[PDB]
Amino acid sequence: SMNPPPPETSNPNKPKRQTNQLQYLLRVVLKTLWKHQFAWPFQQPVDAVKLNLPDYYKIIKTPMDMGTIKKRLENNYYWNAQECIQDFNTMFTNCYIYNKPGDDIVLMAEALEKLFLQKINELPT
Ligand SMILES: Cn1cc(-c2ccc3cc(C(=O)Nc4ccccc4N)ccc3n2)c2cc[nH]c2c1=O
Numbered sequence: 001s002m003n004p005p006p007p008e009t010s011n012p013n014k015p016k017r018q019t020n021q022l023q024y025l026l027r028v029v030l031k032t033l034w035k036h037q038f039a040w041p042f043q044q045p046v047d048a049v050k051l052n053l054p055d056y057y058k059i060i061k062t063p064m065d066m067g068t069i070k071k072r073l074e075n076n077y078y079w080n081a082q083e084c085i086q087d088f089n090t091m092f093t094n095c096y097i098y099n100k101p102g103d104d105i106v107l108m109a110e111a112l113e114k115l116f117l118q119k120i121n122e123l124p125t
Helices: 020-034 066-074 081-098 104-120
Strands: none
Touching: 020 066, 020 081, 020 104, 066 081, 081 104
16 A cells, blocks of 8 residues: 555553653643644544555655554553654654645644644643
8 A cells, every 4th residue: 555554552561651741641732632623634644545645655754643642642652751742743743844834734733733832831740
């Protein structure tokens, strides 16, 4: 297929461990972004076939989306909050490097990123 396998979302041999920051990332950050009116293009991996983006996975080396992040948080896949923050950053970077500035998708990403950064400003210690 034009599309890669989706990113892994479970780690069967990793111990389960919560942190205050991981709780915040799921229950505050992800939840707020997931419900936002602009979330829909970011709730699942980019399907380059259906969206007619034949060069997407040539350009984007590290695919990322909020459906993957959500499942990773729910499955306790991340060892620490910084790994999760990096996935959010990667998802936004992918959007900004692939799509033309001023494309609707870019303005949506920017609105979501602004909300993300505001919540990250209040990340627990
Ligand atoms: C991250 N990302 C994501 C997308 C992405 C993903 C999911 C999409 C889904 C629809 C869709 O179902 N539209 C629809 C159909 C019927 C009724 C109402 C609506 N809104 C339309 C466009 C989509 N574009 C994208 C496209 C170019 N570049 C990117 C890009 O970088």
